[PDB]
Structures are given as structure tokens and as C-alpha cells.
Amino acid sequence: MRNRREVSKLLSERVLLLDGAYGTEFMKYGYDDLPEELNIKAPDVVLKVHRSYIESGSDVILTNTFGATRMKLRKHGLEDKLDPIVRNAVRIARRAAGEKLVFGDIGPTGELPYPLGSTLFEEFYENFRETVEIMVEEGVDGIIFETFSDILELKAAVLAAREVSRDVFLIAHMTFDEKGRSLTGTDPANFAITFDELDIDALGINCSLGPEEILPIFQELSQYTDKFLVVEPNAGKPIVENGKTVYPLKPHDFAVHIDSYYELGVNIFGGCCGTTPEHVKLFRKVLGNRKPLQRKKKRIFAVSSPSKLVTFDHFVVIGERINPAGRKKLWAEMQKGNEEIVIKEAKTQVEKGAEVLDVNFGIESQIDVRYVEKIVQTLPYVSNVPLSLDIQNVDLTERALRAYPGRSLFNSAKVDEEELEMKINLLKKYGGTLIVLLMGKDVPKSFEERKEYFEKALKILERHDFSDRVIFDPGVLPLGAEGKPVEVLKTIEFISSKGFNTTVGLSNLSFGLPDRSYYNTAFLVLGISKGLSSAIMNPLDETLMKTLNATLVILEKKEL
Amino acid sequence: MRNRREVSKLLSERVLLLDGAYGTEFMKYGYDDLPEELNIKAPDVVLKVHRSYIESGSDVILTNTFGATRMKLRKHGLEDKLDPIVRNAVRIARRAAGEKLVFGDIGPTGELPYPLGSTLFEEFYENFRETVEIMVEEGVDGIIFETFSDILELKAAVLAAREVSRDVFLIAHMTFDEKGRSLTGTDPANFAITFDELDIDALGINCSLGPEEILPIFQELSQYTDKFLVVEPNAGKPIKTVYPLKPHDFAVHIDSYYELGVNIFGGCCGTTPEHVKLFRKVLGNRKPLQRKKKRIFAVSSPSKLVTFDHFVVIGERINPAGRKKLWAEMQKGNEEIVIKEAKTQVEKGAEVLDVNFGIESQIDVRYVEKIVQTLPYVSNVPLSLDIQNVDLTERALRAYPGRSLFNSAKVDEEELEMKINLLKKYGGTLIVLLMGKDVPKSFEERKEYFEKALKILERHDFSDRVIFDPGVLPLGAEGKPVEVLKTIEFISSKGFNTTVGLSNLSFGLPDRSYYNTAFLVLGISKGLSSAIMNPLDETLMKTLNATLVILEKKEL
Ligand SMILES: N[C@@H](CCS)C(=O)O
Ligand SMILES: N[C@@H](CCS)C(=O)O
Ligand SMILES: [K+]
Ligand SMILES: [K+]
Ligand SMILES: [Y+3]
Ligand SMILES: [Zn+2]
Ligand SMILES: [Zn+2]
Hints:
homodimer
């Protein structure tokens, strides 16, 4: 068993060759059984296939465990054979490989996450945890999650693997259709942006498409991560001939693509379904001995849901409405675990132009933690958009972040050493960006005071290597409570000038005032003129939204 | 006959004494006839009274003609005696004065301007012109309009006088009540700003109040004009014979008027030669004090002075373009509809009203002259006169009761000289639109027009009487409002007021209220000081108020 430090060192020195397909090989040997069952029924066939790749020059082989998790095995009446299936697979692969690397191979369950399917984050997490336990015990040199179609299920798999072992080399893959999207809508930039910041060692792509079709998809992935890169295309895109799936790409026509992947920074190259030992033999000759290429990676501030990447390069409307403050009905209904009411609020806001939704659960001791976990998992699927998680309690925050399907915005940390560090650390573990509110020991009462908090924040951020993952909220105070909005506008202009995104809790300005719509509208227009890049605001306020649109058109940021 | 250069020279050297009352003196000697009639019926009594004031120390005497104009004499069956009344008055005053100054004295007619009464501007103008001609013929050293209560009537008088003679020394007075207001609502700063820029030589106050009561009113007047200042307080309310304010107490106020820059001091109703004797003893020989006037940019109506030290809403609605019904009433000379539109806009927050007559050549000038005179009285607020025809421009400016804003000259040598000259003659301020031969598109293009304009305005000494309009183009027609916003910020940085025709931004687009609002907020954030806009748009107006509250230009 090699740990992640050893494997990373090896990769830094040499581009490695993976193996070909297993599922599409076994039939050629007269075995059409579920591949994982062969680990018990015919371990000799499994050994032969591994050896076929070792003898073709592979540096790494995958264990015969693609469908070996409880949730998937259950569908085939084999759940009670998890332990021997996985143990035998690892033992067989180790026998074939000798000193070569063995990666524990885990695919997805075929179960969609709730609300598309019935499955909650917690169930996927425990499912992947149990297979990874066996693999780590049996001494794998890494874990690879192949052919994932949904980011929540993949996030669960990575987090479960990392909780079993902080030392194992961990590789996360998605598979993409010909339009460059996963089943639940994630494009390669979103995949990269979301997963780069988790404690995985490598990202990659396998299956669905051939080497030609993957290239631009892989290029986009490579632009947004600095982690190691893996690719395993099919031997051409699958076609049906005389009632069977055929992968028509021959060894030379597949191998010619190696250079193009190498140029994009590939670290491990292999093949998925349709790839045979004949392909791998040629890959071995063509790849030879190469040091991988350095890349940087584009840096962007973006948040995501499964189907939407929201980049802060245009004004971002953050819908404020999922917040039970002053909403007696919503508050009562949240406490009873009503999902439909919150779902309706989400969809309406998006229909009216919210691109991200703030979600707050009021007096958090009064709310069921399981309802928070379900709401957070559900809204990005049903409403399509990313969330701003507006949570006070650090424990509940951890629950929400662990279960969030994408890269969230976390609403909010004040400028306090202890509070900032706690919230930063949670985001470092589970992914995400942070709103930093410019107040602390007290509430600022001028531009200069806000500027001092901003600089204190930057010092704490730099120390935690977190400066690129923040948006600043200068702290809008109520007009009727000596709010002094000119001071906020000065602060917006100042922070924008420094290259940071900004947001405000817009509706705070007009709290306790009649004609709040007009105060909110006037303030938003002024803020945008100073560089304000987003706002938590009411998208159902038609005057606010129409004036916003007019403002963006006028300032040449969009439209007609 | 001294000319105004001669009289000014004298005033620059010494504070002069006027005379006391005539009307109340003639009454007290038992003459209950109109004072002006005595020029025919008892010339020796007129001569006696003038002589008593000269002996008492007056440097200047007033001709006995206070009520001697055609419109006033007609109310007494005496209009056919205008000519002999005024000529005898001047001849008698000259006999009395010797080398001393004789000013032709003209008071108001007692007729209110339409619509408070029935008199139009032109009728007042003709009335004063006739009396000034006779006085100038007979050789006065000046003309003084005493005891005026209305700024339109006074404007007619001063323009009439100046049409007769550009050389005669001209003094314009208003009389103010205890609240510092003329009958039709003009306060001393309004009076000063409106009349200072007309071609008069002095401004002043007489009657209605005593020396003490006039002092703060006179101080206000003194702060807003650099011209010569005159005062003639009355001797209080009589309680008919016996007036309360006697020579010694009246005269002890002279020092306070001297310290405020007074140039001629006299007395009005109830004062006597014995008062003047004391003015002489108290004043002696003093050079007048120098002063620096406060400088502001302001427009006016009889009852309102609007200073551009806060955001000014200029109502756009009296404009028949795209409005078939309004236009049909304008063409049939309907006054009531325009009045209703004016009133509603002011009710909604308009502080100035833009007034445009559409296809001007299809509109009766009488109607225009009538609307222009009427609206400031009934609606209370100043007008932005939005007129293209240069002849109609002259008639509207001439008849306008106050200091107007004139809606628009482009940056063009010929057009500017034309408009500037009319405004120099009739009073007023100018919107200068930043286009010329070509409509500009960029910020630097607009800046070039601005500095072209500044060079033209500086050579005409008109720099201080302009608002700049950067020229807003419709968004659907390659507008680029960002260029306009940059121009506003620049012009503001140079200390100049700005305006825009707001509704042009959103011409042809849907949801125009939202584009108008967004641009207005953005403009204000850059220094925009006014806009021609729709005060009936609740969204616009409420968002405007919010903007000013947020930016600390006004309280919650
Ligand atoms: N490692 C798996 C991939 C299935 S998509 C196999 O080769 O069968
Ligand atoms: N000069 C006139 C003024 C009357 S207000 C007079 O002395 O009678
Ligand atoms: K493989
Ligand atoms: K007098
Ligand atoms: Y620490
Ligand atoms: Zn595959
Ligand atoms: Zn008098």
C-alpha cells in the first residue's frame, strides 16, 4: 500500500498508464455474469483480465468492484456478499499487479438523490464508507470514483472516503454526455470548481464518449483545477450494431489522442468500456516515459448547484424570501417540516430573476436538523439555482455544508478572529465561499470604521489562505436607526476598487419605514453605480426588479 | 438734466438726502384735492413745499406726480389733464431745486395684473411709457418708481422707462408689509434678484412701515444687489393728522441704514421738513459704504424664489406633444386646462413648470402672453419658458412676472448672442444645450461643446446665468446615457448647475417610468441639480425623495 504522498510523488515524475475495460472484456471469456459476482464465482477470469492489462504495460489497475456497494449490490440480490466481493477483488488485483498500483474502483449506485430519487446524502455517504473501509483494509494504493453522473452522490462518495482515510490517494470522476453535461446537469467547469477545493488528489473523466469527444470537455476541466488529472475514454462513442453495443475505435486511432491529453496536463491515461488489452499495448508504446506538464488554472469566484454555475461577473440577485423573520406562516410551517412551502418560495423567486437563493431557518433550536438537511439537498434540484446558506449555529452549518449539492455561499461571518476561523475551516473541509460582514466587537458608524474592519478581515483571510473565497458585505443599517447609507456607498466603492465582490442585505435599509420599495430601489441603484456586485433582496418587488434591469441597461452591463 | 453716469458719480461720492412726504403735507395744510391737481390749481403751494425740503437739506426732490399716470387719473376723471399735471409738476420742481436733483416720481396704478385683476403687461407698459416721455421731455434728473406692490407692474414700468431713455437714472422701489412681503408675495431677496439684473440704477423701499420695521427688510435687499440703494420709511400709522414717529426718533435710525450701504435716504407719508432737518443734522457728509452682494442662482415668480441649492423638479407636462386633447385646447385658447395641469404638478412637487406651446405658429400670441403672465400667479411657481420662435421668445420674456429660466439655446455663436441679449434686456437665466451643428455622442464631444459655450458665455459676461443640459438621447436610438452621466459629473465638478429632459431617455421604450427613475437616481449621484420630468409619476417621485434622503440632501 502506497499513500497519497507516495502516489503524488510518482505522478509528479511520470505520466502513468491505467488499464482498459473489465465489464466489456468478461463476455469474451464466456462470462456474462455481473462482473462483481465473478470475484466469487470465477476469480480466475478476473485474474486473467487484470493480467491482460499488466502484461500490456499498465502502471495501475482497477479492482473489479465498480458495482460493489450495498445500494447497487442490493438490486442484484448480492448485498450480503459485499464483504467477500470486495476483499476477493482487492486480493485478486494485488496478485496480478505485484509492485504496480492497485486502485479500489467504485462506481455510482444508479439511485438519484432526493427529490429526483428517494435517497438522502446520509445514505449515499454510509453506502460508500463501507466499501472504502474494506478497500483501505485490504491495502489499495488509491480509491477512484468512476462514471459518476450526479455531484451530490459524488460529494458523498469523496467525503465518505476521506473520513475513512486521510492518507489514501483519492480520484473523483464524472461522466459527461456529448453536450458536456452530467445526468443532473453539471458541466466540467462546475465539476472542477466544486471538487477542486475538496480534499481529493485528482479529478477526471471516464466513459460515455470517445477520446475525440472528451478532449474539449477535458480541456475545460483542466482549466479549473490544479489537481492531478485522469482520463479514460470509451474506445469511440458507443454504437449499436446487430442488437449489441459496439465500441468501434481501433488501437491506433485511439492511441493517436495521447499527445493531445498530455498537452492538457493529463497525469494518468487509460480507457473505459470498449478498451481492450490491444489498445493498452499500443498506449504503452505511444505514451512511453513522460514527465507531466505544469498548468496554472483560471481563478474565478462562482457558486453552483447541480445544473447552474453562477459566476460573479455580472450583478447577482440573491433572493431573500426563504427567511421566517416577520413571516408567521412560514415560521410555523418550517417548524412542522413543511418542504412544499419553501419549495414554492424558491421557484417563484427564481421565476422572477433570483440567480441564488438565501435560506435561513429562524430560531435554529426550534428546527429539525433533518429538515435543514433535506431542504438544503432539495432546493438546488427543484429551483435549479445555488444557495446562500444563512445559518447561525456552527453545528447546523456543518450539516448543511456536508449535504449541499455544489459550491455554496455561506451567509455570514463577522470580523472576529474566532468566528472567522471556525467558519473558514468548515468551508475548507466541505467547499464553499463566504460572506464577510464588516462589523465585530461593535457595529461601524463610518466609512473609516468599515475600512478598518475590511483590513482586519484581509489579514485574517490571508493567514488562512482564504482571500479568494469571500464576498464583502459592508453592513447596511436601517435609515430610521441613523443608518448613514452614504457611508455604506463609500465602502462599496472602496471594496470594488480593491477587486472584491460585494453584497448587501438590502431590505435592512428600509426596516421600519413606509415606502420601503422606493428606499430599497434608490439604494440599489446607487450601490450598483459604486460597483455593488450582488444583493440579498426581494425579487418579487416588481419596481425594484424593473428599475434594476433599467439600471444595468443604462450602465452598459446588459440588454435592450 | 443730469444723466445716469453723472448721478452715479455723485452717489459714489456722497450719501444723498431725498425729501419727505407731499400727499400728507398737502392734506395737513388743508388741501384735500388730489396732490397732483395742485400743480394746476395751487402751484405756489407745491413750490413752497419743495422749497421747504430744499432748505431743510434735501439733495433730491420728487416731482408732485405720484398719481399722475393715465390709468390712475382715469379713475378720477382726470386723464385729459395728464399732460399739464406732469409738465407743470416738473417745471415747479425745477424752479424749487436750483442746482439740486429733480426725480420724476411715478407710483403704481392701483390695478392688479391679470388674473388677480384684468390688466395685461402691455397695458401697464404703455401707461408708464406715456408719463416717462413727458418727464424726460421736461428734463428730469432721474425717474423713481415708488411704492410698487407687484413685480409685473414694476417690470412694465422699468422697461417702459428704459425704452424712452437709456440715459436717465432709474430707481425701482417696492413697498413691503410687516412680514417682508409685497401685496402679490414678493420678498426683498426675490425683488433684488429679479430687478438687479435689469438696466435700472438703484433699488429701494418706501412707505408702509417706519424706519425700525424696514431695517431687516432693507438689510435683505442690500445683500442681493450691488446697485445703489434708496430708502424712505413712513412716519408710522396715524391716529388723518398726527403721525407717531417724530423727527428725532426717525432720524436716529440713519446710522443703521448707512452701515447697510444706503445711498439715498428720505421720508415717505407722514414725514415733514422738520424730519429732513434732522436727517441733515444726523447724516452730515458721508461717502457711501462699499458692499459685496451674496451670489446665488435663482429663478422667480411673484411669490416664490427657487434657488438651485437643492434638487429642482421642473414639471414637463404643459407640453402638447403626444397629447391631442391638451393641444386642441391650446388651439382654442383654453386657459383653464393649463391652469389645472400647472396646479396638479405643483401639488405633486414641481417647483418650476416647463411651458411649451407646440406648433407655435398655430398658437395665438395673445394666449401665450396671457398664459405666461397668469401661471406664476395661480400656480405660484416660476416658469421654464420652452419656446423656439425668437419673436414669441421676446413677447414671453417681456411679459414674464419674475426671473424665468429660458428653455434652450444650443452652442452656436448666433443663437447664443440672440438669446443672451434678450435675457440681458428682459431678465432671466438660460439652459445651454450641449449640441450645435452636430449632436455629440461621447463625453469628450460634450466637454468640447461645454468649453466652447464657456468661452462664448465669458465674452458676453453671462457665465453666471446658465444651467447646462448635456442632452439626453433615447436609449432605443444609440443614446449611451453613460456618456451623459460622465458629462454631468464633469460640469458639476466645474461649479455649474445641470438639467436634463428626463423623459427623452425612455422615448419609444416600454416601462419608461423605470428607465426614467434609474437614470434620475444615477444622474443625481453625479451632481445633477434639476430635471425636466413628470411629477405625476409616483414611482419616479417617491424614488427621487428616497434618493435625496439616502444622500443626505434631505431628512426622512
Ligand atoms: N471500470 C469499469 C467502468 C464501467 S463504466 C469497467 O471497466 O467495467
Ligand atoms: N412721494 C409720494 C409717496 C406716496 S406713497 C408722496 O410723498 O406723497
Ligand atoms: K480502465
Ligand atoms: K420723499
Ligand atoms: Y487558530
Ligand atoms: Zn465505462
Ligand atoms: Zn408713502
